[PDB]
């Protein structure tokens, strides 16, 4: 969705969110520390400007006089006070609610209270709303389910049938008028009435075919169930998103979920793959780890100037897309062996990414004729990881470590042949 100021939300949101770092165990100090570290580490300089509050911020046990109350134990100066502090550092503040009767963690939520909550969030100076999808009561549930392989039983190749799920929507169903669309549109409309600009992140997990109606409603939409800090989760979301990239352009980006950089059992290679593909798919990039414990190597990864420039390109709205699946035939839905060969144009040239989904080193080759927008011949090439010149090349062949991604930027043609 386009926003009134003509800029905010046009390219993907960059920031930090408490959830993958702290889950339900949050307080004001955690946000202030995050804000200070985003500035001092250079992350703000790299473009990361949102400090986003996730679930568990309010008094759990009900509204106070019809309003969601901040938990004052956690936020002694309120959300408004926190917003002041964050804004003084040149940053923006995000908050969280749910399009249901309680949040996913059981806190007050906004279904039927969209105008009241929007007004409070705006009065506090909040800049960004993550709006989750738990706890939808009967009179607001959808009639049917959409074919979302993360939530519905599938046959081969991620296909749905009413034999597999008798509540699967009939052929031709118009999701743009489902109850899910209504629930999210109600919050769109409430936020749009406020005299403070709040962008809407639609945390709907790829449900209700948000791909078809999302752009009319918010700036971004989750496209899968919740991420976990492991390779299986990374490949699952990569596979799912690889089929949905025609929904991604200016003002409306599929959200591959909060980054797991620095977390869990992800290896160095797996972490590069995750970051690089989230960037290239033009998902919002929300850091989700305690920055006080994040290695400099991971900080430097998050600041990768080429991946950030690509993600943030103000001329090319579309993401990198798969040009060859690799181990499987093109367009094969597979949660463990997603599409390997990706590319897309930008102001700085064509970004090309080659994911090694095998668990041993493998040679991978970027062949220009295979890549949309390029043709046989020689191009000037740069390695995105090392920022080194790779020369004037007729193709690019690399040994890629297990679960790593080779990433290059293809510049000008350097010979006609
Ligand atoms: C498993 O499930 C998946 C997901 O549902 C199914 O995926 C199908 O697979 C189809 C092929 O079986 C595939 O059809 C191809 O479509 C391309 C055009 O693709 C563009 O436009 C489509 C419609 O709007 C989009 O769906 C595409 O988006 C998808 O792909 C992009 C990446 O490419 C992703 O970014 C995106 O997220 C999404 O996944 C995309 O925007 C056709 O070009 C292609 O046509 C082929 O046969 C034609 C002959 O009839 C021929 O004319 C074509 O020419 C090509 O090759 C020629 C050389 O022979 C060249 O000369 C031409 O220049 C050209 O390059 C070509 O040979 C084919 O129709 C669908 O797009 C895809 N749908 C989706 C949503 O992904 C699988 O089929 C399932 N697998 C099994 C098995 O069941
Ligand atoms: C969800 O809804 C939104 C809102 O409706 C949809 O957003 C719309 O997306 C389209 C597709 O991306 C936008 O159209 C395209 O915009 C780009 C970029 O325009 C801006 O770029 C121009 C270039 O900047 C230059 O900067 C350079 C330095 O960095 C330098 O070289 C120059 O000095 C320039 O300053 C600039 O002229 C504009 O003013 C912008 O500021 C265009 O490049 C596209 O044109 C290309 O595509 C055309 C159509 O194919 C065609 O003419 C030709 O191919 C051309 O090369 C194109 O116009 C559109 O603006 C945008 N709408 C809004 C309101 O922002 C979104 O698509 C939708 N999602 C989906 C999935 O549909
Ligand atoms: C508001 O937040 C406080 C602080 O996290 C919560 O109080 C903690 O509650 C746990 C579980 O009962 C106790 O173990 C801690 O000792 C409490 N900490 C402090 C500093 O008191 C509290 O439950 C929250 N209240 C509401 C209504 O959400
Ligand atoms: C997902 O793709 C992989 C890779 O092509 C499939 O794994 C192969 O399966 C065949 C049959 O079991 C074996 O011969 C190969 O050894 C497997 N290769 C690897 C690298 O593991 C897998 O079956 C696919 N999954 C589904 C459900 O289709």
Question: Is residue 177 lining ligand 2, measured as CB closer than 6 Å?
Answer: no
Q: Which residue(s) pair with 355 in the sheet?
A: 405
Q: Nominal resolution in Å?
A: 1.5
Residues 282 and 337 both lie in one domain: no
Q: Which residue(s) pair with 254 in the sheet?
A: 221
CATH number of the domain encompassing residue 407:
2.60.40.1180
Q: Which of 264, 299, 315 is the last residue of a domain?
A: 315
Residues 322 and 310 both lie in one domain: no
Residues 347 and 200 both lie in one domain: no
Contact indicator for 89, 129 with CB cutoff of 8 Å: no
Residues 303 and 349 both lie in one domain: no
Contact indicator for 136, 111 with CB cutoff of 8 Å: yes
Residues 297 and 336 both lie in one domain: no
Residues 385 and 329 both lie in one domain: yes
Question: Is residue 103 lining ligand 3, measured as CB closer than 6 Å?
Answer: no
| Alpha-carbon separation of residue 366 from 7, 152, 330 (angstroms) | 35, 36, 16
Residues 133 and 190 both lie in one domain: yes
Residues 230 and 379 both lie in one domain: no
Q: Which of 315, 335, 353 is the last residue of a domain?
A: 315
φ and ψ at residue 336, rounded to 5 degrees: -100, -30
CATH number of the domain encompassing residue 7:
3.20.20.70
Burial class (CB in 10 A: 0-12, 13-18, 19+), 157: exposed
Question: Is residue 71 lining ligand 3, measured as CB closer than 6 Å?
Answer: yes
Residues with Cβ < 8 Å from 85, sequence gap 6 or more?
Answer: 32, 35, 77
Contact indicator for 263, 233 with CB cutoff of 8 Å: no
Contact indicator for 97, 118 with CB cutoff of 8 Å: no
Residues 264 and 321 both lie in one domain: no
Contact indicator for 15, 50 with CB cutoff of 8 Å: yes
Q: Which residues of 117-154 are buried (b: 16+ CB within 10 A; e: fewer)?
A: bbbbbbebbbbbbbbbbbbbeeebebebbbbbbbebeb
Token pair in block for residue 366: 């970027």
Question: Is residue 105 lining ligand 3, measured as CB closer than 6 Å?
Answer: no
Residue nearest to atom 15 of ligand 4 (CA): 327
Distance CA(44)–CA(408), nearest Å, equals: 25
How far, in Å, is the centroid of ligand 1 from the Cα of 127? 39
Token pair in block for residue 311: 């993600």
Q: Which numbered atom of ligand 2 lies nearest the CA of 246?
A: 71
How far, in Å, is the centroid of ligand 3 from the Cα of 115? 29
Question: Is residue 337 lining ligand 4, measured as CB closer than 6 Å?
Answer: yes
| Alpha-carbon separation of residue 29 from 171, 248, 325 (angstroms) | 50, 35, 45
Q: Which of 315, 331, 359 is the last residue of a domain?
A: 315
Total structural domains in the chain?
Answer: 2
Q: What is the domain extent for residue 386?
A: 316-417
Residues 283 and 325 both lie in one domain: no
**Method of structure determination:** X-ray
How far, in Å, is the centroid of ligand 4 from the Cα of 232? 15
Which of the residues are catalytic? 132, 226
Residues 236 and 361 both lie in one domain: no
Whats the size of the chain, residue-wise?
Answer: 417
Residues 335 and 196 both lie in one domain: no
Cα Rg for the chain, rounded, in angstroms?
21
């Amino acid at each position: 969705i386009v926003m009134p100021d003509g800029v905010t939300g046009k390219v993907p949101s960059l920031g930090w969110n408490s959830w993958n770092a702290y889950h339900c165990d949050i307080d004001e100090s955690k946000f202030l520390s995050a804000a200070e570290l985003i500035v001092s580490s250079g992350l703000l300089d790299a473009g990361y400007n949102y400090v986003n509050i996730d679930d568990c911020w309010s008094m759990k046990d009900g509204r106070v006089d019809g309003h969601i109350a901040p938990n004052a134990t956690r936020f002694p100066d309120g959300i408004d006070g926190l917003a002041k502090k964050v804004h003084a550092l040149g940053l923006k503040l995000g908050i969280y609610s749910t399009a249901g009767t309680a949040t996913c963690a059981g806190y007050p939520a906004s279904l039927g209270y969209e105008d009241v909550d929007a007004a409070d969030f705006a009065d506090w100076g909040v800049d960004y709303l993550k709006y989750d999808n738990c706890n939808v009561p009967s009179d607001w549930q959808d009639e049917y389910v959409a074919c979302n392989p993360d939530f519905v039983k599938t046959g081969p190749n991620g296909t749905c049938t009413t034999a597999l799920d008798p509540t699967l929507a009939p052929p031709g169903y118009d999701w743009s008028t489902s109850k899910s669309a209504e629930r999210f549109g109600a919050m769109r409309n409430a936020l749009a009435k406020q005299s403070h600009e709040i962008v809407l992140s639609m945390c709907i997990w790829g449900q209700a075919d948000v791909f078809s109606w999302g752009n009319s409603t918010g700036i971004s939409w989750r496209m899968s169930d919740d991420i976990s800090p492991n390779w299986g989760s990374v490949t699952r979301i990569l596979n799912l998103n690889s089929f949905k990239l025609n929904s991604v352009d200016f003002w409306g980006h599929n959200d591959a979920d909060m980054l797991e950089v620095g977390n869990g059992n992800l290896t160095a290679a797996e972490t590069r793959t995750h970051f690089a593909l989230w960037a290239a798919m033009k998902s919002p990039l929300l850091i989700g780890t305690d920055l006080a414990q994040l290695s400099q190597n991971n900080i430097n990864l998050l600041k990768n100037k080429h991946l950030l420039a690509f993600n943030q390109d103000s001329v090319y709205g579309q993401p990198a897309t798969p040009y060859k699946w690799g181990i499987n035939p093109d367009w094969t839905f597979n949660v463990t062996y997603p599409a390997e060969f990706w590319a897309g144009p930008s102001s700085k040239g064509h970004l090309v990414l080659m994911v090694n989904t095998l668990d041993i080193t493998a040679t991978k080759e970027a062949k220009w004729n295979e890549i949309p927008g390029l043709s046989a011949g020689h191009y000037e090439v740069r390695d995105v990881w090392s920022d080194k010149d790779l020369g004037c090349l007729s193709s690019y062949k690399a040994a890629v470590a297990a679960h790593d991604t080779a990433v290059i930027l293809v510049g000008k043609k350097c010979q006609r042949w």
